[PDB]
Structure formats: structure tokens, C-alpha cells
Ligand binder design. Structure first.
Ligand SMILES: OC[C@H]1O[C@@H](O[C@H]2[C@H](O)[C@@H](O)[C@H](O)O[C@@H]2CO)[C@H](O)[C@@H](O)[C@H]1O
Ligand SMILES: OC[C@H]1O[C@@H](O[C@H]2[C@H](O)[C@@H](O)[C@H](O)O[C@@H]2CO)[C@H](O)[C@@H](O)[C@H]1O
Ligand SMILES: [Ca+2]
Ligand SMILES: [Ca+2]
Ligand SMILES: [Mn+2]
Ligand SMILES: [Mn+2]
Lengths: 239, 239
């Protein structure tokens, strides 16, 4: 069994194991701000930011045919301060090719370039979508499981607790090829759950980068915050 | 689509839609006590109690070949007041043949008669096991998915927050034959999750009874409480 794991109760500026891209930034108070926040303390539009763990993770081995089981936990808060226009765009937990750079922003959440399903992406993502695009279901916000496409294969609407901290748990069992995610708002006690079959062996490359990505809207004030307070990850490749 | 749903924020004594069996009892304060509590306020051993919704639910149709998607939510607390011996036995959410009576107590949680896998049971259960029997994994308590057998096909250890209220969400997606359950302890913020493939069409009869069951140990003081504070259920059979 080879393993890998990190666990941040809070974030520390200048930490080497974290790669910040785009607007992504860590405050001295220990919080990770994926998207830009102005001097007046309010969310800026047309912003994209990502954070990747500096070490690649071995998700599966082509030689032995074994695939790893993994689990990730993080807590974040999304604040939508504007009355109008509609807020955007959301944040995602993703896995993909190592040494990747930010893709398209807005509805693409910084991890995709278009709305076409392209196995060439080799990207798996669990999104918390706050804006309804042409490819999205009517309800927002919604949790979505993205496999090589911004058009989720599965979707689950949820109630946003504006400014409140949400706890997320995403788990993958290699034995059943089952990916289950959970969203919990400690404040209200609300619980949301999504699950779906995902063959990691058919989607991702043997080695991947794990990260978080966030993005704000394409027009003035179509924004919200994407703050992350903690993040842990663990993977186990048997053989 | 035919549907059915109930939602109890609290329990009311004398409610007609609830069938109490065994020691099961509802207090005037609105709580459902599955297992007996003595005059000294402490849990009694050798106790078994169950509660079933008085109306059967159509889980699948053999004629159209359609299967229903369902979701159930309930909150409970288990208090293990004795230093010794080890506490037992746990509680379960189950689905099975309509008009059923309590089965064996103790490790069988009141829904099974033996440890043998018998498709004749036609019982599906999500257990919160507090005692480790010969057929259980070493770790207790643990969440377990039971399909026609007390020997879970899947298990997940969890940390008991003695006397604290736990929130549970069990969901079944007919499209993926996926059963995902979640346990959350609001107090500590702990989150546990289990998921597995279950073909309801192959396990349960077209019509079933949904209920909760609890049981205490086979020897003096091998007990704990099994209190339920709320319970809601919803099912949707398309066609
Ligand atoms: O408003 C946030 C929303 O914008 C979409 O892009 C719009 C853009 O805002 C609008 O000014 C222009 O005329 O058309 C674009 C396409 O409809 C983004 O695509 C969406 O993801 C959000 O960011
Ligand atoms: O102690 C709780 C535990 O008891 C098991 O049954 C025991 C019984 O307690 C003991 O006195 C007797 O000698 O042997 C039985 C079988 O090992 C139950 O099976 C278990 O579910 C718990 O209830
Ligand atoms: Ca979107
Ligand atoms: Ca047991
Ligand atoms: Mn979406
Ligand atoms: Mn068990």
C-alpha cells in the first residue's frame, strides 16, 4: 500500500506544499481566498483562482491494475452580497493531469475550456455551482459530479446558507467504483448527499494533481466569495 | 409517479400511523424509546422494540419493472452509561415484508433470526451496531448495510458521542442502484459516510414496511439507550 495525506486545520502563508494559481491567496488569519476580494471587502467579478497540492498523487497503477481509494474533506463559505445581478460562478474540488494551469473561468470554474465532453480532459470534479448556465439544470446552487465535462453526469440542488461555513466530505471506494459526496451546514443542520459510479481507471491518468478552484462572473457584480478554511486529503493504492 | 411520505418533528403518543412493537414506547415529551428504560432512568438489558409506519410502501412494480427512489431521515441518541460490561446491541432502519413481527433480539437487532444469509428474509437494513459479534468486524460502533443477513456486506466504523444526538440521512437512487447513508454528530461536527450497490428489485418484495428497531444485550447491564427524536420518509415510484 503506498499512501499520501495532508491535513490543514488552517492555511499558512508561504507553505511549500501548496501551489497558488491565479487570484488564489492565503490571508495572515489563515484562510484561503480562491477569488479576489476588493479593498472595500467585497467580492470582485471576473476572477479565477486555484490551489493545488504540490505533490502529485498515485491514483492507480496500469501495471498491477489496482486503483486507489481516497477521501477529502474541506470547509468553505460562499457569500453573495449583491442584490443584483445574479451571483456566480462557484467552486470545485478537482483531480487531473499533473502540472496543470488554470483553464477557462466563469461557468467553466477554471478547470475546463468548453462545454464539450472531451475524454482528453482527464479531469474529475465535484462542483458547487452557483450560476445556471445553458448546460446546467435550472436550480442553483447545486452540487455536481463532473467527468471530463462541465455538464455534470449527476446533479443535486441545495440551499445556500449565505456567509455560513459548509463542511464537505468526498469519498471514493475503489471496490465499488463509487463516489459519494456530502455537504453539511452545521448552522442549520442541513445535509445534502450525491453519489454516482465513476471508473477512475477510465477517466484519470495514473498520477494526478488534487486541488480547489473558484471563479466569479463575467459581468460587474456577478460575484461572491469562495473562502476555504481547512482541507485534508488521503489516498491509498494497495500493491 | 405514486408517492408516500411522512415527517415527524417529534412523536405524539397514540398516533395511528405508527405501529409500536415490543418495548417500543413514546413519551409525553415526544421522544420514541425503542428499548426499555427503568424507573431509575437507566437502560434495561434483554430488551427489544420496533416501530413501523402503519402504511405499506410500494417500492417497486413487477409489471412495469420500475423501482422507487427513496430517502429517510431520523435523529437519535445512544447513551452507554455502564462501565462494564460492554454495551449492546444497537439500532437499525429497515425495510421488509409487510405485517412483520419482531425477530430475534441481541445481535440480530430484532430483524433477523440467525446469522445465515437467507434471501427468504427479503430485508434491507442500515445498522448502527454497538457490540461486536462473531460475524462483526472488530471495530464498534459501526454503520453497516445489511442485505438479507446480519453479516453486513459493507461496514464503516464511527466514533460514538455518548448521549449526543446524531443525524442520519439514508438515500437510494434507483437509476444507479446506489444506497448512500450519512451519520452526522452536530456537536462535534463529525461526518461518516457509507455507500454500496443494492438491487432493491432482487432483494425486497413489491410492497414493504419501513421501520426502526433497537435491542439491548443478553446479560445484565449490557445495555444502552436507543432514543429517536424525529423521523421522515419519502418514496417515489415512477409509472
Ligand atoms: O452574469 C454572470 C454569468 O455571465 C455569463 O456570461 C455572460 C456575460 O455576463 C454577459 O455580459 C454576456 O453578454 O454574455 C455572456 C454569455 O451569456 C457566464 O457565462 C456565466 O458563467 C456567469 O459568469
Ligand atoms: O453481552 C452482550 C452480548 O451478549 C451476547 O450473548 C452472550 C451472553 O451475554 C452470555 O452471557 C452467554 O454466555 O453467551 C452469549 C453468546 O456469546 C449477544 O449475542 C450479543 O449480541 C450481546 O447482546
Ligand atoms: Ca454554472
Ligand atoms: Ca452486533
Ligand atoms: Mn453545474
Ligand atoms: Mn454489525
Amino acid at each position: 500500500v503506498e499512501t499520501i495525506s495532508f491535513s490543514f486545520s488552517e492555511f499558512e502563508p508561504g507553505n511549500d506544499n501548496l501551489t497558488l494559481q491565479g487570484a488564489s491567496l492565503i490571508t495572515q488569519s489563515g484562510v484561503l481566498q480562491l477569488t479576489k476580494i476588493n479593498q472595500n471587502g467585497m467580492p470582485a467579478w471576473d476572477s479565477t483562482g486555484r490551489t493545488l497540492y504540490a505533490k502529485p498523487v498515485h491514483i492507480w497503477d496500469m501495471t498491477t491494475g489496482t486503483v486507489a481509494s481516497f477521501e477529502t474533506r474541506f470547509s468553505f463559505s460562499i457569500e453573495q452580497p449583491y442584490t443584483r445581478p445574479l451571483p456566480a460562478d462557484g467552486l470545485v474540488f478537482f483531480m487531473g493531469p499533473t502540472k496543470s494551469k488554470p483553464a477557462q473561468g466563469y461557468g467553466y470554474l477554471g478547470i475546463f475550456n468548453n462545454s464539450k465532453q472531451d475524454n482528453s480532459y482527464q479531469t474529475l470534479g465535484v462542483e458547487f455551482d452557483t450560476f445556471s448556465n445553458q448546460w446546467d439544470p435550472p436550480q442553483v446552487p447545486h452540487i455536481g459530479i463532473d467527468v471530463n465535462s462541465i455538464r455534470s453526469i449527476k446533479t443535486q440542488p441545495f440551499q445556500l446558507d449565505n456567509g455560513q461555513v459548509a463542511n464537505v466530505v468526498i469519498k471514493y471506494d475503489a471496490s465499488s467504483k463509487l463516489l459519494h459526496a456530502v455537504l453539511v451546514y452545521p448552522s442549520s443542520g442541513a445535509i445534502y448527499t450525491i453519489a454516482e459510479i465513476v471508473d477512475v481507471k477510465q477517466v484519470l491518468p495514473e498520477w494526478v494533481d488534487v486541488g480547489l478552484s473558484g471563479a466569479t462572473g463575467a459581468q460587474r457584480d456577478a460575484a461572491e466569495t469562495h473562502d476555504v478554511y481547512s482541507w485534508s486529503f488521503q489516498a491509498s493504492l494497495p500493491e
